[PDB]
Amino acid sequence: TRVEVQPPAQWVLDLIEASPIASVVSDPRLADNPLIAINQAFTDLTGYSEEECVGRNCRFLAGSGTEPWLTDKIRQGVREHKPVLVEILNYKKDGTPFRNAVLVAPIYDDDDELLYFLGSQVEVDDDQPNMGMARRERAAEMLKTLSPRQLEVTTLVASGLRNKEVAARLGLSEKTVKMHRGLVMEKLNLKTSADLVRIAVEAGIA
Ligand SMILES: Cc1cc2nc3c(=O)[nH]c(=O)nc-3n(C[C@H](O)[C@H](O)[C@H](O)COP(=O)(O)O)c2cc1C
Ligand SMILES: [Cl-]
Ligand SMILES: [Cl-]
Ligand SMILES: [Mg+2]
Ligand SMILES: [Mg+2]
């Protein structure tokens, strides 16, 4: 099955298009919380075109060997609106199995109103099955270079808070919070907010 999805808004494209890693957005108000957008890296990772993806739950990547104790942690994150990083067996369009380090995180529209989910997918090679631990080491070292305000803005943002909630928590203006966010993005060479949530969760700070 597949549902017809409205063309994605600019904020959806801004979240994933410039990411170097496979990234997707789902809309939980549509049938089966289906993908509403994928970036180019998702098509090159999986072999699926945007036409084949949009309208479908991302569990189309699952197959015979997929670990239900690890997918349930994603279901849990979707339910509790909390970010989850698991490494699960998935299958490309050509049936090629691959280990997928998948982040699923709650994210808000550019008006901070409605909830969506951001997904991002990194292949862990059969050659080098501990690649995930090397990403977490890199993430932890980068996040340690941040100033104290930048680090705690990053922590609250990656936890899935709207800017208005981060601003409430820290006694700042939304404008000030977005200023600190931008500075983190520039300092750590992060193209998208999705890339920022990924290193936070990799590091263990959210
Ligand atoms: C944004 C997003 C991205 C997802 N990416 C993947 C993925 O790459 N591979 C996968 O097997 N599941 C992925 N999932 C998880 C499934 O869509 C589903 O949430 C999970 O399998 C647990 O639900 P279920 O028990 O109904 O399958 C993603 C979920 C969301 C919301
Ligand atoms: Cl889901
Ligand atoms: Cl302020
Ligand atoms: Mg495209
Ligand atoms: Mg299942």
PDB file of C-alpha atoms and ligand atoms in Angstrom:
ATOM      1  CA  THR A   1       0.000   0.000   0.000  1.00  0.00           C
ATOM      2  CA  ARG A   2       0.882   3.747  -0.453  1.00  0.00           C
ATOM      3  CA  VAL A   3      -0.989   7.040   0.290  1.00  0.00           C
ATOM      4  CA  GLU A   4      -0.691  10.221  -1.842  1.00  0.00           C
ATOM      5  CA  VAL A   5       1.399  12.883   0.001  1.00  0.00           C
ATOM      6  CA  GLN A   6       1.208  16.710  -0.458  1.00  0.00           C
ATOM      7  CA  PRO A   7       4.474  18.054  -1.995  1.00  0.00           C
ATOM      8  CA  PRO A   8       6.824  18.763   0.961  1.00  0.00           C
ATOM      9  CA  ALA A   9       7.034  22.331   2.411  1.00  0.00           C
ATOM     10  CA  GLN A  10      10.382  24.242   2.219  1.00  0.00           C
ATOM     11  CA  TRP A  11      11.182  23.462   5.948  1.00  0.00           C
ATOM     12  CA  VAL A  12      10.997  19.671   5.166  1.00  0.00           C
ATOM     13  CA  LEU A  13      13.518  20.041   2.294  1.00  0.00           C
ATOM     14  CA  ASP A  14      15.773  22.298   4.486  1.00  0.00           C
ATOM     15  CA  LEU A  15      15.855  19.556   7.142  1.00  0.00           C
ATOM     16  CA  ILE A  16      17.293  16.789   4.841  1.00  0.00           C
ATOM     17  CA  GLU A  17      18.326  17.968   1.316  1.00  0.00           C
ATOM     18  CA  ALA A  18      21.858  19.237   2.120  1.00  0.00           C
ATOM     19  CA  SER A  19      22.615  16.250   4.502  1.00  0.00           C
ATOM     20  CA  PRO A  20      25.454  13.958   3.293  1.00  0.00           C
ATOM     21  CA  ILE A  21      23.697  11.009   4.949  1.00  0.00           C
ATOM     22  CA  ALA A  22      20.481   9.269   3.896  1.00  0.00           C
ATOM     23  CA  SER A  23      17.683  11.312   5.565  1.00  0.00           C
ATOM     24  CA  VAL A  24      13.877  11.154   5.492  1.00  0.00           C
ATOM     25  CA  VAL A  25      10.822  12.803   7.141  1.00  0.00           C
ATOM     26  CA  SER A  26       7.545  11.047   8.042  1.00  0.00           C
ATOM     27  CA  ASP A  27       4.157  12.564   8.942  1.00  0.00           C
ATOM     28  CA  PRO A  28       2.440  10.744  11.846  1.00  0.00           C
ATOM     29  CA  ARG A  29      -0.996  12.304  10.953  1.00  0.00           C
ATOM     30  CA  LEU A  30      -0.986  10.287   7.672  1.00  0.00           C
ATOM     31  CA  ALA A  31      -1.827   6.582   7.278  1.00  0.00           C
ATOM     32  CA  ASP A  32       0.944   4.448   8.894  1.00  0.00           C
ATOM     33  CA  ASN A  33       3.247   7.439   9.638  1.00  0.00           C
ATOM     34  CA  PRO A  34       4.621   7.338   6.096  1.00  0.00           C
ATOM     35  CA  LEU A  35       7.663   9.031   4.548  1.00  0.00           C
ATOM     36  CA  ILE A  36       6.785  12.477   3.040  1.00  0.00           C
ATOM     37  CA  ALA A  37      10.335  13.161   1.684  1.00  0.00           C
ATOM     38  CA  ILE A  38      13.733  11.487   1.155  1.00  0.00           C
ATOM     39  CA  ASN A  39      17.001  13.116   0.180  1.00  0.00           C
ATOM     40  CA  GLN A  40      19.281  12.001  -2.661  1.00  0.00           C
ATOM     41  CA  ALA A  41      21.580  10.006  -0.274  1.00  0.00           C
ATOM     42  CA  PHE A  42      18.568   7.798   0.715  1.00  0.00           C
ATOM     43  CA  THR A  43      18.024   6.814  -2.964  1.00  0.00           C
ATOM     44  CA  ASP A  44      21.795   6.124  -3.416  1.00  0.00           C
ATOM     45  CA  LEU A  45      21.938   4.080  -0.126  1.00  0.00           C
ATOM     46  CA  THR A  46      18.804   1.942  -0.720  1.00  0.00           C
ATOM     47  CA  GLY A  47      18.271   2.121  -4.538  1.00  0.00           C
ATOM     48  CA  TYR A  48      14.614   3.243  -3.977  1.00  0.00           C
ATOM     49  CA  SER A  49      13.427   6.369  -5.931  1.00  0.00           C
ATOM     50  CA  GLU A  50      11.474   9.130  -4.110  1.00  0.00           C
ATOM     51  CA  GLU A  51       8.335   7.873  -6.008  1.00  0.00           C
ATOM     52  CA  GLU A  52       8.817   4.365  -4.526  1.00  0.00           C
ATOM     53  CA  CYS A  53       9.312   5.718  -0.951  1.00  0.00           C
ATOM     54  CA  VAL A  54       6.829   8.589  -0.333  1.00  0.00           C
ATOM     55  CA  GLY A  55       3.477   7.362   1.055  1.00  0.00           C
ATOM     56  CA  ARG A  56       4.961   4.251   2.742  1.00  0.00           C
ATOM     57  CA  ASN A  57       6.167   3.478   6.271  1.00  0.00           C
ATOM     58  CA  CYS A  58      10.003   3.143   6.257  1.00  0.00           C
ATOM     59  CA  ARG A  59       9.616  -0.487   7.559  1.00  0.00           C
ATOM     60  CA  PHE A  60       9.645  -1.445   3.791  1.00  0.00           C
ATOM     61  CA  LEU A  61      13.469  -1.608   4.465  1.00  0.00           C
ATOM     62  CA  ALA A  62      12.877  -4.463   6.955  1.00  0.00           C
ATOM     63  CA  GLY A  63      13.162  -8.132   5.983  1.00  0.00           C
ATOM     64  CA  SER A  64      13.498 -11.727   7.297  1.00  0.00           C
ATOM     65  CA  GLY A  65      16.479 -11.045   9.691  1.00  0.00           C
ATOM     66  CA  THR A  66      15.270  -7.624  11.080  1.00  0.00           C
ATOM     67  CA  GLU A  67      15.410  -7.497  14.926  1.00  0.00           C
ATOM     68  CA  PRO A  68      11.948  -6.766  16.457  1.00  0.00           C
ATOM     69  CA  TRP A  69      13.582  -5.903  19.878  1.00  0.00           C
ATOM     70  CA  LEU A  70      15.444  -3.091  18.032  1.00  0.00           C
ATOM     71  CA  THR A  71      12.465  -1.919  15.883  1.00  0.00           C
ATOM     72  CA  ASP A  72      10.309  -1.839  19.066  1.00  0.00           C
ATOM     73  CA  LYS A  73      12.817   0.751  20.470  1.00  0.00           C
ATOM     74  CA  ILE A  74      11.983   2.968  17.441  1.00  0.00           C
ATOM     75  CA  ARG A  75       8.211   2.383  18.035  1.00  0.00           C
ATOM     76  CA  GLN A  76       8.883   3.396  21.692  1.00  0.00           C
ATOM     77  CA  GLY A  77      10.683   6.596  20.519  1.00  0.00           C
ATOM     78  CA  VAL A  78       7.791   7.457  18.171  1.00  0.00           C
ATOM     79  CA  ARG A  79       5.325   6.869  21.084  1.00  0.00           C
ATOM     80  CA  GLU A  80       7.382   8.776  23.722  1.00  0.00           C
ATOM     81  CA  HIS A  81       8.581  11.462  21.242  1.00  0.00           C
ATOM     82  CA  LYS A  82      12.267  10.718  22.068  1.00  0.00           C
ATOM     83  CA  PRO A  83      15.256  10.168  19.724  1.00  0.00           C
ATOM     84  CA  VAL A  84      16.439   6.538  19.188  1.00  0.00           C
ATOM     85  CA  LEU A  85      19.572   5.227  17.402  1.00  0.00           C
ATOM     86  CA  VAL A  86      19.584   1.435  16.672  1.00  0.00           C
ATOM     87  CA  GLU A  87      21.612  -0.688  14.244  1.00  0.00           C
ATOM     88  CA  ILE A  88      19.177  -3.016  12.431  1.00  0.00           C
ATOM     89  CA  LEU A  89      19.323  -5.441   9.473  1.00  0.00           C
ATOM     90  CA  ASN A  90      17.586  -3.836   6.462  1.00  0.00           C
ATOM     91  CA  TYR A  91      17.383  -4.702   2.756  1.00  0.00           C
ATOM     92  CA  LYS A  92      18.033  -2.543  -0.308  1.00  0.00           C
ATOM     93  CA  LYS A  93      15.667  -2.482  -3.263  1.00  0.00           C
ATOM     94  CA  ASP A  94      17.824  -5.202  -4.966  1.00  0.00           C
ATOM     95  CA  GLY A  95      17.462  -7.487  -1.848  1.00  0.00           C
ATOM     96  CA  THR A  96      21.064  -6.744  -0.623  1.00  0.00           C
ATOM     97  CA  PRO A  97      21.034  -7.030   3.193  1.00  0.00           C
ATOM     98  CA  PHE A  98      22.824  -4.195   5.083  1.00  0.00           C
ATOM     99  CA  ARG A  99      23.356  -3.098   8.649  1.00  0.00           C
ATOM    100  CA  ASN A 100      21.583   0.267   9.034  1.00  0.00           C
ATOM    101  CA  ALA A 101      22.492   2.656  11.892  1.00  0.00           C
ATOM    102  CA  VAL A 102      19.083   4.391  11.922  1.00  0.00           C
ATOM    103  CA  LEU A 103      18.243   7.558  13.943  1.00  0.00           C
ATOM    104  CA  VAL A 104      14.513   8.331  14.390  1.00  0.00           C
ATOM    105  CA  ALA A 105      13.838  11.710  16.111  1.00  0.00           C
ATOM    106  CA  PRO A 106      10.826  13.927  16.765  1.00  0.00           C
ATOM    107  CA  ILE A 107      10.988  17.275  14.908  1.00  0.00           C
ATOM    108  CA  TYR A 108       8.565  20.267  14.555  1.00  0.00           C
ATOM    109  CA  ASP A 109       7.510  22.276  11.406  1.00  0.00           C
ATOM    110  CA  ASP A 110       9.052  25.761  10.907  1.00  0.00           C
ATOM    111  CA  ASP A 111       6.080  27.252  12.924  1.00  0.00           C
ATOM    112  CA  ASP A 112       6.930  24.959  15.938  1.00  0.00           C
ATOM    113  CA  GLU A 113       3.337  23.606  15.679  1.00  0.00           C
ATOM    114  CA  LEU A 114       2.953  20.080  14.336  1.00  0.00           C
ATOM    115  CA  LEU A 115       5.172  17.068  15.126  1.00  0.00           C
ATOM    116  CA  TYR A 116       6.950  15.033  12.414  1.00  0.00           C
ATOM    117  CA  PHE A 117       9.783  12.436  12.528  1.00  0.00           C
ATOM    118  CA  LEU A 118      13.237  12.790  11.023  1.00  0.00           C
ATOM    119  CA  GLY A 119      15.044   9.579  10.081  1.00  0.00           C
ATOM    120  CA  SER A 120      18.669   9.158   9.050  1.00  0.00           C
ATOM    121  CA  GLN A 121      20.342   5.962   7.887  1.00  0.00           C
ATOM    122  CA  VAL A 122      24.096   5.086   7.807  1.00  0.00           C
ATOM    123  CA  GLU A 123      25.282   1.775   6.345  1.00  0.00           C
ATOM    124  CA  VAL A 124      27.636  -0.136   8.711  1.00  0.00           C
ATOM    125  CA  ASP A 125      29.791  -2.385   6.413  1.00  0.00           C
ATOM    126  CA  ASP A 126      30.168  -6.182   6.948  1.00  0.00           C
ATOM    127  CA  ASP A 127      33.982  -5.439   6.622  1.00  0.00           C
ATOM    128  CA  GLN A 128      33.957  -2.947   9.575  1.00  0.00           C
ATOM    129  CA  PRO A 129      30.941  -3.829  11.824  1.00  0.00           C
ATOM    130  CA  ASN A 130      32.176  -1.456  14.698  1.00  0.00           C
ATOM    131  CA  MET A 131      31.988   1.700  12.473  1.00  0.00           C
ATOM    132  CA  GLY A 132      29.122   2.925  14.700  1.00  0.00           C
ATOM    133  CA  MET A 133      31.466   3.167  17.728  1.00  0.00           C
ATOM    134  CA  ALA A 134      33.932   5.259  15.622  1.00  0.00           C
ATOM    135  CA  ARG A 135      31.061   7.667  14.736  1.00  0.00           C
ATOM    136  CA  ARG A 136      30.185   7.968  18.466  1.00  0.00           C
ATOM    137  CA  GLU A 137      33.860   8.716  19.335  1.00  0.00           C
ATOM    138  CA  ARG A 138      34.018  11.420  16.613  1.00  0.00           C
ATOM    139  CA  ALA A 139      30.645  12.860  17.764  1.00  0.00           C
ATOM    140  CA  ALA A 140      31.779  13.043  21.459  1.00  0.00           C
ATOM    141  CA  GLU A 141      35.106  14.830  20.534  1.00  0.00           C
ATOM    142  CA  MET A 142      33.307  17.418  18.313  1.00  0.00           C
ATOM    143  CA  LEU A 143      30.583  18.179  20.928  1.00  0.00           C
ATOM    144  CA  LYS A 144      33.350  18.709  23.583  1.00  0.00           C
ATOM    145  CA  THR A 145      34.706  21.693  21.565  1.00  0.00           C
ATOM    146  CA  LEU A 146      31.397  23.575  22.092  1.00  0.00           C
ATOM    147  CA  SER A 147      31.052  26.440  24.603  1.00  0.00           C
ATOM    148  CA  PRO A 148      28.772  25.737  27.607  1.00  0.00           C
ATOM    149  CA  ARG A 149      25.669  27.607  26.195  1.00  0.00           C
ATOM    150  CA  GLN A 150      26.138  25.989  22.709  1.00  0.00           C
ATOM    151  CA  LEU A 151      26.378  22.511  24.308  1.00  0.00           C
ATOM    152  CA  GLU A 152      23.163  22.796  26.386  1.00  0.00           C
ATOM    153  CA  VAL A 153      21.214  24.400  23.421  1.00  0.00           C
ATOM    154  CA  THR A 154      22.407  21.393  21.348  1.00  0.00           C
ATOM    155  CA  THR A 155      21.354  18.943  24.136  1.00  0.00           C
ATOM    156  CA  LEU A 156      17.794  20.435  24.415  1.00  0.00           C
ATOM    157  CA  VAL A 157      17.356  20.766  20.579  1.00  0.00           C
ATOM    158  CA  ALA A 158      18.500  17.110  19.990  1.00  0.00           C
ATOM    159  CA  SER A 159      16.036  15.927  22.752  1.00  0.00           C
ATOM    160  CA  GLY A 160      13.324  17.114  20.275  1.00  0.00           C
ATOM    161  CA  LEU A 161      12.238  20.452  21.937  1.00  0.00           C
ATOM    162  CA  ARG A 162      10.761  23.295  19.800  1.00  0.00           C
ATOM    163  CA  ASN A 163      12.951  26.511  19.865  1.00  0.00           C
ATOM    164  CA  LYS A 164      10.212  28.100  22.002  1.00  0.00           C
ATOM    165  CA  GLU A 165      10.639  25.221  24.549  1.00  0.00           C
ATOM    166  CA  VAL A 166      14.446  25.554  24.529  1.00  0.00           C
ATOM    167  CA  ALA A 167      13.945  29.363  25.078  1.00  0.00           C
ATOM    168  CA  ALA A 168      11.495  28.653  27.993  1.00  0.00           C
ATOM    169  CA  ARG A 169      13.944  26.147  29.617  1.00  0.00           C
ATOM    170  CA  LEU A 170      17.004  28.500  29.440  1.00  0.00           C
ATOM    171  CA  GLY A 171      15.270  31.949  29.977  1.00  0.00           C
ATOM    172  CA  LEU A 172      16.272  33.177  26.488  1.00  0.00           C
ATOM    173  CA  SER A 173      14.481  34.540  23.378  1.00  0.00           C
ATOM    174  CA  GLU A 174      13.749  32.194  20.444  1.00  0.00           C
ATOM    175  CA  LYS A 175      15.937  34.523  18.357  1.00  0.00           C
ATOM    176  CA  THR A 176      18.872  33.962  20.784  1.00  0.00           C
ATOM    177  CA  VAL A 177      18.345  30.152  20.739  1.00  0.00           C
ATOM    178  CA  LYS A 178      18.357  30.089  16.882  1.00  0.00           C
ATOM    179  CA  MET A 179      21.534  32.296  17.001  1.00  0.00           C
ATOM    180  CA  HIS A 180      23.351  29.720  19.228  1.00  0.00           C
ATOM    181  CA  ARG A 181      22.048  26.829  17.013  1.00  0.00           C
ATOM    182  CA  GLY A 182      23.461  28.501  13.869  1.00  0.00           C
ATOM    183  CA  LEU A 183      26.857  29.023  15.578  1.00  0.00           C
ATOM    184  CA  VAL A 184      26.988  25.254  16.469  1.00  0.00           C
ATOM    185  CA  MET A 185      26.098  24.344  12.815  1.00  0.00           C
ATOM    186  CA  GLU A 186      28.881  26.653  11.499  1.00  0.00           C
ATOM    187  CA  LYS A 187      31.498  25.500  14.071  1.00  0.00           C
ATOM    188  CA  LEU A 188      30.888  21.764  13.521  1.00  0.00           C
ATOM    189  CA  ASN A 189      30.420  21.976   9.635  1.00  0.00           C
ATOM    190  CA  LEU A 190      26.826  20.577   9.921  1.00  0.00           C
ATOM    191  CA  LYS A 191      24.711  21.175   6.763  1.00  0.00           C
ATOM    192  CA  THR A 192      21.282  20.456   8.374  1.00  0.00           C
ATOM    193  CA  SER A 193      19.491  20.238  11.792  1.00  0.00           C
ATOM    194  CA  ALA A 194      19.278  16.483  11.069  1.00  0.00           C
ATOM    195  CA  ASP A 195      23.131  16.220  11.050  1.00  0.00           C
ATOM    196  CA  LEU A 196      23.100  18.145  14.427  1.00  0.00           C
ATOM    197  CA  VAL A 197      20.577  15.682  16.026  1.00  0.00           C
ATOM    198  CA  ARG A 198      22.621  12.700  14.692  1.00  0.00           C
ATOM    199  CA  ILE A 199      25.985  13.698  16.345  1.00  0.00           C
ATOM    200  CA  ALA A 200      24.167  14.564  19.634  1.00  0.00           C
ATOM    201  CA  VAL A 201      22.522  11.136  19.785  1.00  0.00           C
ATOM    202  CA  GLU A 202      25.770   9.343  18.545  1.00  0.00           C
ATOM    203  CA  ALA A 203      27.689  11.074  21.414  1.00  0.00           C
ATOM    204  CA  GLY A 204      25.081  10.106  24.054  1.00  0.00           C
ATOM    205  CA  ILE A 205      24.023  13.696  24.951  1.00  0.00           C
ATOM    206  CA  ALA A 206      20.370  13.037  23.811  1.00  0.00           C
TER     207      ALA A 206
HETATM  208  C1  LIG B   1      11.286   8.862  10.155  1.00  0.00           C
HETATM  209  C2  LIG B   1      11.419   7.376  10.302  1.00  0.00           C
HETATM  210  C3  LIG B   1      12.475   6.706   9.712  1.00  0.00           C
HETATM  211  C4  LIG B   1      12.593   5.306   9.801  1.00  0.00           C
HETATM  212  N1  LIG B   1      13.637   4.676   9.169  1.00  0.00           N
HETATM  213  C5  LIG B   1      13.653   3.346   9.241  1.00  0.00           C
HETATM  214  C6  LIG B   1      14.650   2.626   8.527  1.00  0.00           C
HETATM  215  O1  LIG B   1      15.583   3.177   7.924  1.00  0.00           O
HETATM  216  N2  LIG B   1      14.552   1.255   8.553  1.00  0.00           N
HETATM  217  C7  LIG B   1      13.592   0.566   9.305  1.00  0.00           C
HETATM  218  O2  LIG B   1      13.603  -0.694   9.314  1.00  0.00           O
HETATM  219  N3  LIG B   1      12.702   1.224  10.050  1.00  0.00           N
HETATM  220  C8  LIG B   1      12.714   2.545   9.996  1.00  0.00           C
HETATM  221  N4  LIG B   1      11.748   3.215  10.693  1.00  0.00           N
HETATM  222  C9  LIG B   1      10.879   2.454  11.616  1.00  0.00           C
HETATM  223  C10 LIG B   1       9.608   1.916  11.119  1.00  0.00           C
HETATM  224  O3  LIG B   1       9.039   2.903  10.323  1.00  0.00           O
HETATM  225  C11 LIG B   1       8.746   1.569  12.346  1.00  0.00           C
HETATM  226  O4  LIG B   1       8.622   2.704  13.156  1.00  0.00           O
HETATM  227  C12 LIG B   1       9.405   0.508  13.229  1.00  0.00           C
HETATM  228  O5  LIG B   1       9.651  -0.667  12.446  1.00  0.00           O
HETATM  229  C13 LIG B   1       8.578   0.138  14.433  1.00  0.00           C
HETATM  230  O6  LIG B   1       7.156   0.101  14.118  1.00  0.00           O
HETATM  231  P1  LIG B   1       6.519  -1.281  13.785  1.00  0.00           P
HETATM  232  O7  LIG B   1       6.612  -2.167  15.014  1.00  0.00           O
HETATM  233  O8  LIG B   1       5.066  -1.025  13.430  1.00  0.00           O
HETATM  234  O9  LIG B   1       7.382  -1.815  12.579  1.00  0.00           O
HETATM  235  C14 LIG B   1      11.655   4.605  10.603  1.00  0.00           C
HETATM  236  C15 LIG B   1      10.625   5.306  11.241  1.00  0.00           C
HETATM  237  C16 LIG B   1      10.473   6.653  11.088  1.00  0.00           C
HETATM  238  C17 LIG B   1       9.334   7.353  11.802  1.00  0.00           C
HETATM  239 CL    CL B   2       5.957   4.463  12.665  1.00  0.00          CL
HETATM  240 CL    CL B   3      17.907  36.213  25.058  1.00  0.00          CL
HETATM  241 MG    MG B   4      15.485  14.799  -4.597  1.00  0.00          MG
HETATM  242 MG    MG B   5       7.050  -5.728  13.332  1.00  0.00          MG
END
